[PDB]
Amino acid sequence: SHTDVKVPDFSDYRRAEVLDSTKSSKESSEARKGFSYLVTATTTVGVAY
Amino acid sequence: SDLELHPPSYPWSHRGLLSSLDHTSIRRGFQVYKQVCSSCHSMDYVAYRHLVGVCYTEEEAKALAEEVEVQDGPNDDGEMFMRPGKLSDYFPKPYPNPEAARAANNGALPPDLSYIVRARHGGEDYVFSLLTGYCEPPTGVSLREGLYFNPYFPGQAIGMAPPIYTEVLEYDDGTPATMSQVAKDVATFLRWASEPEHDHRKRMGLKMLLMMGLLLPLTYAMKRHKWSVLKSRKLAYRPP
Amino acid sequence: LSRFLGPRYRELARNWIPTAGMWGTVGAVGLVWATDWRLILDWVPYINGKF
Amino acid sequence: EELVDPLTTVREHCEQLEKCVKARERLELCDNRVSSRSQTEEDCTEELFDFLHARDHCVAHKLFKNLK
Amino acid sequence: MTNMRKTHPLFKIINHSFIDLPAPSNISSWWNFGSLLGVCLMVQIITGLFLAMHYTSDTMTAFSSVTHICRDVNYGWLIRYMHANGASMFFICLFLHVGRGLYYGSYTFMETWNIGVLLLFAVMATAFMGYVLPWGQMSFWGATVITNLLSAIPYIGTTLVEWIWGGFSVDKATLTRFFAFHFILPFIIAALAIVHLLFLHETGSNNPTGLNSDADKIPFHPYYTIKDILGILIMFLILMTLVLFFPDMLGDPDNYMPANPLNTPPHIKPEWYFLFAYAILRSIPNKLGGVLALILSILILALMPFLHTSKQRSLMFRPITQILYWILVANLLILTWIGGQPVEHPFIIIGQLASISYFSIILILMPISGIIEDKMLKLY
Amino acid sequence: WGGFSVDKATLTRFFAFHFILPFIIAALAIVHLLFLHETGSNNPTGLNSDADKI
Amino acid sequence: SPTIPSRLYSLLFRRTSTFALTIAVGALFFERAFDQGADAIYEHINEGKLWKHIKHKYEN
Amino acid sequence: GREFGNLARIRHVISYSLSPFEQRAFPSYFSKGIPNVLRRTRERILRVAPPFVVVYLIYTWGNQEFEQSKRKNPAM
Amino acid sequence: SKWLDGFRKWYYNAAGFNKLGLMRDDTLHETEDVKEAIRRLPEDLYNDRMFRIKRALDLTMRHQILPKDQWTKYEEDKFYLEPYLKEVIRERKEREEWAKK
Ligand SMILES: CCCCCCCCCCCCCCCCCC(=O)OC[C@H](COP(=O)(O)OCCN)OC(=O)CCCCCCCCCCCCCCCCC
Ligand code: HEC
Numbered sequence A: 001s002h003t004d005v006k007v008p009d010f011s012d013y014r015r016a017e018v019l020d021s022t023k024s025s026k027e028s029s030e031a032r033k034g035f036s037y038l039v040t041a042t043t044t045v046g047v048a049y
Numbered sequence B: 001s002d003l004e005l006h007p008p009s010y011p012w013s014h015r016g017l018l019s020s021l022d023h024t025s026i027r028r029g030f031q032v033y034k035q036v037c038s039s040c041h042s043m044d045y046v047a048y049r050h051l052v053g054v055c056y057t058e059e060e061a062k063a064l065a066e067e068v069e070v071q072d073g074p075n076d077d078g079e080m081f082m083r084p085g086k087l088s089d090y091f092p093k094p095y096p097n098p099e100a101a102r103a104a105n106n107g108a109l110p111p112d113l114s115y116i117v118r119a120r121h122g123g124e125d126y127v128f129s130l131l132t133g134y135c136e137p138p139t140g141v142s143l144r145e146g147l148y149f150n151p152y153f154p155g156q157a158i159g160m161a162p163p164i165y166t167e168v169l170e171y172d173d174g175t176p177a178t179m180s181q182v183a184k185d186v187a188t189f190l191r192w193a194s195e196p197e198h199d200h201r202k203r204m205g206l207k208m209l210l211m212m213g214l215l216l217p218l219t220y221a222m223k224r225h226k227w228s229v230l231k232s233r234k235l236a237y238r239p240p
Numbered sequence C: 001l002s003r004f005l006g007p008r009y010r011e012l013a014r015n016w017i018p019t020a021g022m023w024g025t026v027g028a029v030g031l032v033w034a035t036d037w038r039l040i041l042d043w044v045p046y047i048n049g050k051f
Numbered sequence D: 001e002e003l004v005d006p007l008t009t010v011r012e013h014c015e016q017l018e019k020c021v022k023a024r025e026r027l028e029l030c031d032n033r034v035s036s037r038s039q040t041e042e043d044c045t046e047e048l049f050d051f052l053h054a055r056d057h058c059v060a061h062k063l064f065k066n067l068k
Numbered sequence E: 001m002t003n004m005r006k007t008h009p010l011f012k013i014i015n016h017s018f019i020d021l022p023a024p025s026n027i028s029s030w031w032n033f034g035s036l037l038g039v040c041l042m043v044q045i046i047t048g049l050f051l052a053m054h055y056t057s058d059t060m061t062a063f064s065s066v067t068h069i070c071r072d073v074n075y076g077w078l079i080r081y082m083h084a085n086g087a088s089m090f091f092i093c094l095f096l097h098v099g100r101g102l103y104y105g106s107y108t109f110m111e112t113w114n115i116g117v118l119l120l121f122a123v124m125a126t127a128f129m130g131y132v133l134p135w136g137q138m139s140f141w142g143a144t145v146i147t148n149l150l151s152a153i154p155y156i157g158t159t160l161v162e163w164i165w166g167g168f169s170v171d172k173a174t175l176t177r178f179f180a181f182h183f184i185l186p187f188i189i190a191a192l193a194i195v196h197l198l199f200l201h202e203t204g205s206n207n208p209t210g211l212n213s214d215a216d217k218i219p220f221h222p223y224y225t226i227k228d229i230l231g232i233l234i235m236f237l238i239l240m241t242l243v244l245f246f247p248d249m250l251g252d253p254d255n256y257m258p259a260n261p262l263n264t265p266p267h268i269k270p271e272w273y274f275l276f277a278y279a280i281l282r283s284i285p286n287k288l289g290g291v292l293a294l295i296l297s298i299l300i301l302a303l304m305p306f307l308h309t310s311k312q313r314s315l316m317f318r319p320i321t322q323i324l325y326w327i328l329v330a331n332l333l334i335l336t337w338i339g340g341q342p343v344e345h346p347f348i349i350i351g352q353l354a355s356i357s358y359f360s361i362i363l364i365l366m367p368i369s370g371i372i373e374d375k376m377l378k379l380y
Numbered sequence F: 001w002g003g004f005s006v007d008k009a010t011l012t013r014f015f016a017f018h019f020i021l022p023f024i025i026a027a028l029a030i031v032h033l034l035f036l037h038e039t040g041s042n043n044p045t046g047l048n049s050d051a052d053k054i
Numbered sequence G: 001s002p003t004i005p006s007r008l009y010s011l012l013f014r015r016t017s018t019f020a021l022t023i024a025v026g027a028l029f030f031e032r033a034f035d036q037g038a039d040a041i042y043e044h045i046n047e048g049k050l051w052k053h054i055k056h057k058y059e060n
Numbered sequence H: 001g002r003e004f005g006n007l008a009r010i011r012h013v014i015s016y017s018l019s020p021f022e023q024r025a026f027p028s029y030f031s032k033g034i035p036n037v038l039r040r041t042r043e044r045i046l047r048v049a050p051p052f053v054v055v056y057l058i059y060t061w062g063n064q065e066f067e068q069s070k071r072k073n074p075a076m
Numbered sequence I: 001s002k003w004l005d006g007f008r009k010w011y012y013n014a015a016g017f018n019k020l021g022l023m024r025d026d027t028l029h030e031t032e033d034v035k036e037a038i039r040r041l042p043e044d045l046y047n048d049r050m051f052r053i054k055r056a057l058d059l060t061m062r063h064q065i066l067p068k069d070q071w072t073k074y075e076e077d078k079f080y081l082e083p084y085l086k087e088v089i090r091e092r093k094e095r096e097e098w099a100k101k
């Protein structure tokens, strides 16, 4: 049955601010995207230098 | 004999990974080269303008260039003539051709000391051990005229007389001119003459080390961020 | 290489010996002509006049 | 003549060490064996080289702090 | 319609080669190395081009032009030492690329392997003549030694060596034609690398397990894009610390003297990436046999796909042949050490046993080990 | 120029550039052939020659 | 109060052109700051040895 | 194969992945990075290390044999 | 004998493809005969084989192995591809003999 499948637990890999399934997203997605894009931007600044 | 001797490791001020040369020692070593070493050895790839901003000022290096007389020509009637030296002039050769050097130096040719640190094993340690290592020969070793025993020279029979001693010159800054001090100064000057880019090379290496210490974890974080889709992927096989 | 050990492959090899020998003759003549080899061109009669 | 090279002081102080005097006495034995003999073709370059190796290792440990 | 990346005829080649190329997901960092080679090749070309802007191929001024580059050109010392240490880095990456191909069974891609062997020959010739180019003592004497070993060939060797020399010895004509050939060969190397990539993309690439990776394949972008950029950045870290901190740990000091035909050095060696071949040639007490030993060492590296007698491709599940492979790598390290040593006791017998064990491991022991493994795994 | 006028540096860098550009010309000619081979050649009548090709 | 990367994403990191502008401005200020810091570190390691530390005794 | 349209025939295989912005890039990096590295080292050390140990022994022996060969013999 | 069987189990554990869950016949290099024998497999064994290969590639991708209870034990390593491989090999020898004569 296709309803028998379930996504397994990813909580060993998930971030701390998306670990709780009873709270919403979109009040922490901008922080995660800002952290990852800050890493990318600082890498780009170093490569440009 | 074919058996030889390794020079030891000396604690130079430029021996460290990010440690520069001591430019006062290079200035003293240039004075040692001018007053002692320049009568036999040449510096064909080093000019006076290389000393500006390293050991001497513009007017000091210009006075150093003007105190020697160099070759110029031809004039309007095609005759060679002597002129006062300039900043773009290279250091003057003691001999016009190597055969004249061999005739003046008892067959032996004094080499051009522009890469003599980089062309010898041990570097300036070898030069410091050679200049301070003149000793009496042991028993069973017969030595001809014009040859001198030096255990750091290969073959232990060098054609160079010991060129430095105590008060062999007078320093401009009042440093006492012992044999070890003069040898250390001229070894520092020869290391600078072999590698004039040394300080800028180490500064560039420090900047490169700081940029790579910043850039390795950031590029690693970018790679792990992009690969975390695959590295946490779960698989399942559900045959019917 | 025991795949090609049979009567048919021996017949094929026997059939292709003269063509391969003629091509080897072509290659030897071309090598002698291009390198101007003196060990052979000193024996051919009309070629002797250029030496 | 009244001005002292520090290299001489460091050299004699390094000659006052332990294996340096064993190389010294080995070179003395070589010198007495070679010099007090006739019709030989043996030099004492090896023992002299060992003596200078130990002595100059000691000197290169501690010379440049005495130089300005 | 607007999928220009897969409709533009220029852009679809870059797409098919680097963006939508199906690559195995499980390839390790070893698979980075060939990409590094291409980047390193580009670096060499770029540095060489700027080194071609101030170098004169005249025997009276080649050393003078090298000193003028290192002293008077702004950051010319940086360009020269990046060129030399990039040649060393190129040979490091070649050795690791070839070792990956030997270990993981990648030689079954036979056309890619043979184009690689041709590439390796071209790169070795280019680096040899480039080392001749600065016209130091060791450049002239290494060129003289290598051309004499070329003159060991019977009945055509001497005329061929005087044809390559352009005269009686290594001289002006040899240096100028070596500059011309050292300029022109890396572009042929780049074209052969294009052929290399063409054959590999025709056949697909291998994975460390040696299995059919068609079930689990990922796009090259952005995974191996960011992985090879990380590898390029690590390689540039090692190259720039080798340039800016230890510029002379791989070079030789006697190349900092001008070339003197009257004076010979007490010990003549090539650079470190030719030392194993020098030790292989020098071990046999004959001239033609030693030259054939060097040529057939690289030729049995080419001949490697015909010696595979195992039903498994990679060495991941083959421990006996793993032991033999690491003994072979160890033996290559010993040969590299012996090649930098002069001919006294016991270096002759150590190099002779090293070369004998090298040819015995490649030609005899590895297929016998693979047959023993096939017996032990109950295959037949 | 690499200097105040046309001098030794100009000649040496011109030798390097004159050496290296015909290989770039060869690569650009390969791109030229590819961009022609997407569509075939033109004929002197200027018409669609798809009915008569050899 | 929002987190600082959330404000950076809302202002600068959302649009690619503003991302490039932030990268360029950070490149200027990072170049200047790192040049100052690296020069200070190198000169502090090599106090009394460089020419700029000893040139006042010969400027007369 | 050639391209992602047709490489292999796969039936009944389900795979799960998450967004890169929702998982940590270094999820328990040291605590599970150390034992995996020592596990791989225990798998490969007995095949890799002893040839290089033999190289080190041969290198040291050949070097010391060379400096003992350069010395003189007391027979003369 | 029994000592050879024990040493062969030890070599099976030293080979290490059981740690990825692979069988003996999964590790065979795909030659022409091996691809023909794979094409002659039933679809259940074919799907099992390619899931095992995909899982092994995924485990090698993350540089890990299976838990020790999930390893392929020695006495449950069934040679599924071996009779198909024998059929393909024997008919290829028959065709080779016919072309040889
Ligand atoms: C027997 C087991 C090992 C010894 C006892 C220790 C047991 C420890 C048990 C705990 C578990 C440890 C981890 C196990 C991981 C996987 C298994 C493993 O590593 O096995 C040992 C390994 C390979 O063993 P394997 O290949 O299976 O043996 C073939 C024999 N039929 O490796 C070996 O077997 C050892 C290989 C040694 C090779 C020595 C080579 C010497 C010569 C090198 C010369 C190089 C230079 C040559 C120069 C020539 C010219 C001068
Ligand atoms: C004329 C008497 C000289 C004076 C003054 C200086 N040197 Fe010299 N040097 C001279 C000769 C004839 C030779 C060659 C002799 C030989 O046996 O080869 C040399 C050699 C050197 C070397 C090279 C050593 C080597 O291993 O090749 C060096 C490094 C050297 N000399 C240093 C040196 C210095 C620093 C001097 C100034 C104090 C100096 N020499 C003066 C002749 C003469």
Ligand code: HEM
Pocket (backbone or CB within 6 Å): E041, E044, E045, E046, E047, E048, E049, E051, E052, E055, E066, E080, E083, E084, E086, E087, E088, E090, E123, E126, E127, E128, E130, E131, E132, E133, E134, E182, E183, E184, E186, E187
């Ligand atoms: C077409 C591109 C290239 C050009 C124009 C070029 C040009 C030069 C020049 C002018 C020199 C002499 C300057 C010097 O001594 O440093 C040189 C040296 C050298 N080149 Fe190249 N080169 C090129 C590519 C390569 C490649 C691909 C390699 C091999 C990896 C290589 C290996 C060397 C080596 C080993 C030296 C000697 C370095 C030294 O001892 O100083 N070159 N090259």
Ligand code: HEM
Pocket (backbone or CB within 6 Å): E030, E031, E032, E033, E034, E035, E037, E038, E041, E094, E097, E098, E101, E104, E106, E107, E109, E112, E113, E114, E115, E116, E117, E119, E120, E123, E189, E193, E196, E197, E200, E204, E205, E206, E207
């Ligand atoms: C001139 C230097 C070389 C360059 C630039 C080069 C380039 C590449 C590139 C880009 C790849 C694909 C990426 C990779 O798998 O690493 C590759 C793979 C490969 N190369 Fe080379 N290569 C070079 C030398 C060689 C040599 C000398 C050989 C032969 C021994 C060789 C044989 C191979 C093989 C067999 C592969 C396939 C790897 C696999 O799928 O396992 N290459 N090369």
Ligand code: HEM
Pocket (backbone or CB within 6 Å): F025, F029, F032, F033, F036, F040, F041, F042, F043
């Ligand atoms: C570097 C020198 C050049 C080379 C080697 C080159 C090469 C070629 C070749 C091989 C062809 C196909 C055969 C032919 O139709 O003649 C061709 C066609 C063509 N080339 Fe070039 N070309 C060069 C310069 C140019 C230039 C400067 C132009 C632009 C004005 C140009 C535009 C074309 C066009 C439009 C065609 C298509 C011919 C047609 O279908 O009518 N080429 N070229």
